[PDB]
Design an enzyme around this catalytic site. Structure first.
Site, short mmCIF file in Angstrom:
data_model
loop_
_atom_site.label_atom_id
_atom_site.label_comp_id
_atom_site.label_asym_id
_atom_site.label_seq_id
_atom_site.Cartn_x
_atom_site.Cartn_y
_atom_site.Cartn_z
N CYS A 298 3.33 1.72 9.67
CA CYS A 298 3.18 0.56 8.77
C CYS A 298 4.57 0.11 8.34
O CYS A 298 5.46 0.95 8.14
CB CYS A 298 2.24 0.85 7.60
SG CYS A 298 0.57 1.16 8.24
N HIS B 60 0.85 -1.22 0.00
CA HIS B 60 0.00 0.00 0.00
C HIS B 60 0.88 1.26 0.00
O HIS B 60 0.32 2.38 -0.18
CB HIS B 60 -1.05 -0.03 1.12
CG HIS B 60 -0.55 0.15 2.51
ND1 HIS B 60 -0.95 -0.68 3.55
CD2 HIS B 60 0.28 1.07 3.05
CE1 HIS B 60 -0.38 -0.28 4.66
NE2 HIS B 60 0.38 0.79 4.39
N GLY C 129 2.37 6.23 9.67
CA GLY C 129 3.83 6.17 9.51
C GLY C 129 4.41 4.90 10.11
O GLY C 129 5.60 4.66 9.83
C1 LIG Z 1 -0.01 2.50 7.18
C2 LIG Z 1 0.93 3.67 7.19
O1 LIG Z 1 1.69 3.84 8.13
N1 LIG Z 1 0.88 4.50 6.13
C3 LIG Z 1 -0.19 4.46 5.13
C4 LIG Z 1 -0.84 5.82 5.02
N2 LIG Z 1 0.21 6.78 4.65
S1 LIG Z 1 -0.28 8.17 3.95
O2 LIG Z 1 0.91 8.82 3.48
O3 LIG Z 1 -1.31 7.81 3.03
C5 LIG Z 1 -0.97 9.16 5.23
C6 LIG Z 1 -2.31 9.02 5.55
C7 LIG Z 1 -2.85 9.79 6.57
C8 LIG Z 1 -2.03 10.66 7.25
CL1 LIG Z 1 -2.71 11.62 8.54
C9 LIG Z 1 -0.70 10.79 6.95
C10 LIG Z 1 -0.16 10.03 5.93
C11 LIG Z 1 1.23 6.88 5.71
C12 LIG Z 1 1.89 5.53 5.86
#
Ligand SMILES: *CC(=O)N1CCN(S(=O)(=O)c2ccc(Cl)cc2)CC1
Ligand SMILES: *CC(=O)N1CCN(S(=O)(=O)c2ccc(Cl)cc2)CC1
Lengths: 304, 304
Positions: free
Chosen positions: B145, B41, B143
């Site tokens: 993940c 993802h 962040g």
């Molecule tokens: C699961 C995980 O840690 N991440 C997936 C989501 N991203 S992102 O860059 O789409 C994102 C979504 C929501 C916020 Cl508040 C900040 C970043 C981050 C990494």
């Protein structure tokens, strides 16, 4: 989301753990620069530990009696001194894995990570607090002495604890890294009772804030209280008195949640008076007091 | 003495954590030999995450779109492939800190350490269990993940988990290191409810053994039961059925304490039926189920 009892990553401290043997006594030492720190009772025969005279015992010890092993390689001891209840062993080699570090003496209520070790080998890591009676509730067996407690501020490891003693009540006593015991405890096999283990009120409130942030809100009520009123309830339940300093420290969590500190005090009051009624908060059936306001903010905001 | 929720020392895993950026999405990767493992993802724009077609999304991605940073040094990506729900990024440099390692798929009830990371930087370590509904109760923010779960057998790190998902109920879903989700979960922003979080009976019994070993004995009674009788009580309280296999696994703790497994089953039965009556066991007001028999033996005997 989710809120866990979280230890600091232990890598920087793993790289500092060595084995110290004097005679038959094997325990752990902390290797920082060209100094190995270990409990002075390493020079004792358990018989000695009834009423040891450490200065007199140390006179019979030479540099070559302190066998220091880092993994499978022996360190050469070129000096030894006693500072309070620790030995400082000067070795001829600076620990190449020495992190940026400080020695801090923590206050009761402050939390820290322990790296439990045996024969200078790390077995596990857990989060502790210095209890108001200057004990810690650890997990320590024979061979674990010289295991250290620490906080990490980014790259700087602050060492606050070295493990020395278990009390007959199965709680733990130790020193800062200058070898001064927390509380009244002595490195002697004697009658040493802990005082009242009072609950760290400000930590409980921090953890109630963590709970609200993470969805657990059933305990929020329509009530407020005052510091003086709350403190009558604290006294009754062997909670630490809550000070304006504690209120100020909880300011950021107050701000973020929009729950006034004294309202959360009123929630905690009802919980003390009424119990949990078989409900849980962040997967606990009791009020957790080993998260500081700083711990809650750290975990809830993802600082590294 | 003392019994604590203990994580493995995290050093060997700290040395494997990197940052992976694809477009705006930054999360963590695991660098073992010349491969960086991360959740697939990472290639999604949160909009994509409603119904992403990962094969189609990946077609638009080149080696140079995967920005991989180990501390402050960039790794050169020379290949990428998708295996189930993880990406494998081939880099031109073997991780010099690669420990001895295995990928294992754990069963529900099995415990492991998580190294929570942000931007490839370790923030903390905690002990988890794979729940019977194939969720974990973690502490994960945006962040985090690509953070991994692991056991250590002396020098060998067994990686069992990579963090991918939070469910609207604030519990966590992820993959083994072959990218197969634990349970029915998918890396898609959809309606995904966890099943019953049943209690890991064999783990509760292990922790009751730990309690007896460590002085907490008030819950021992004059009763015994049978597997079939105990299991009627388990069913009623959403406990996992106890099997002869579980009984056999508890053999060593049985031996050491001299308390027959079925007698301890009878103790657990009364605790389920009668509650704790405001008492605690190893500082808990509920029955802890995230220690395996192996965890109890390990901590109670000081394995490194
Ligand atoms: C699961 C995980 O840690 N991440 C997936 C989501 N991203 S992102 O860059 O789409 C994102 C979504 C929501 C916020 Cl508040 C900040 C970043 C981050 C990494
Ligand atoms: C505190 C600690 O870990 N150690 C002090 C006691 N020694 S010992 O060698 O005296 C010893 C006492 C009891 C047993 Cl069962 C084994 C060793 C070990 C280190």
């Amino acid at each position: 989301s989710g809120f866990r009892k979280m230890a600091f990553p232990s890598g920087k401290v793993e790289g500092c753990m060595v084995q110290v043997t004097c005679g038959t006594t094997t325990l752990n030492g902390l290797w920082l620069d060209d100094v190995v720190y270990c409990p002075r009772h390493v020079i004792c025969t358990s018989e000695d530990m009834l009423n040891p005279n450490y200065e007199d015992l140390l006179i019979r010890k030479s540099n070559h009696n302190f066998l220091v092993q880092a993994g499978n390689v022996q360190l050469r001891v070129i000096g030894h001194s006693m500072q309070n209840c620790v030995l400082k062993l000067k070795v001829d080699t600076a620990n190449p894995k020495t992190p940026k570090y400080k020695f801090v003496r923590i206050q009761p209520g402050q939390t820290f990570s322990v790296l439990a070790c045996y024969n200078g080998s790390p077995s596990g890591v857990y989060q502790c607090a210095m209890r108001p009676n200057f004990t810690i509730k650890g997990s320590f067996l024979n061979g674990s002495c010289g295991s250290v407690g620490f906080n990490i501020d980014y790259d700087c490891v602050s060492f606050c604890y070295m493990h020395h003693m278990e009390l007959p009540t199965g709680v733990h006593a130790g020193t800062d890294l200058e070898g001064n015991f927390y509380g009244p405890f002595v490195d002697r096999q004697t009658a040493q009772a802990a005082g009242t283990d009072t609950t760290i009120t400000v930590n409980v409130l921090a953890w109630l804030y963590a709970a609200v942030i993470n969805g657990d809100r059933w305990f929020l009520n329509r009530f407020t209280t005052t510091l003086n009123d709350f403190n009558l309830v604290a006294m009754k339940y062997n909670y630490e008195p809550l000070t304006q300093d504690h209120v100020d420290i909880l300011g950021p969590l107050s701000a973020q949640t929009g729950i006034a500190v004294l309202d959360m005090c009123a929630s905690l009051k009802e919980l003390l008076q009424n119990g949990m009624n078989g409900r849980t908060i962040l997967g606990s059936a009791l009020l957790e007091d080993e998260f500081t306001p700083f711990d809650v903010v750290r975990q809830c905001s993802g600082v590294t």
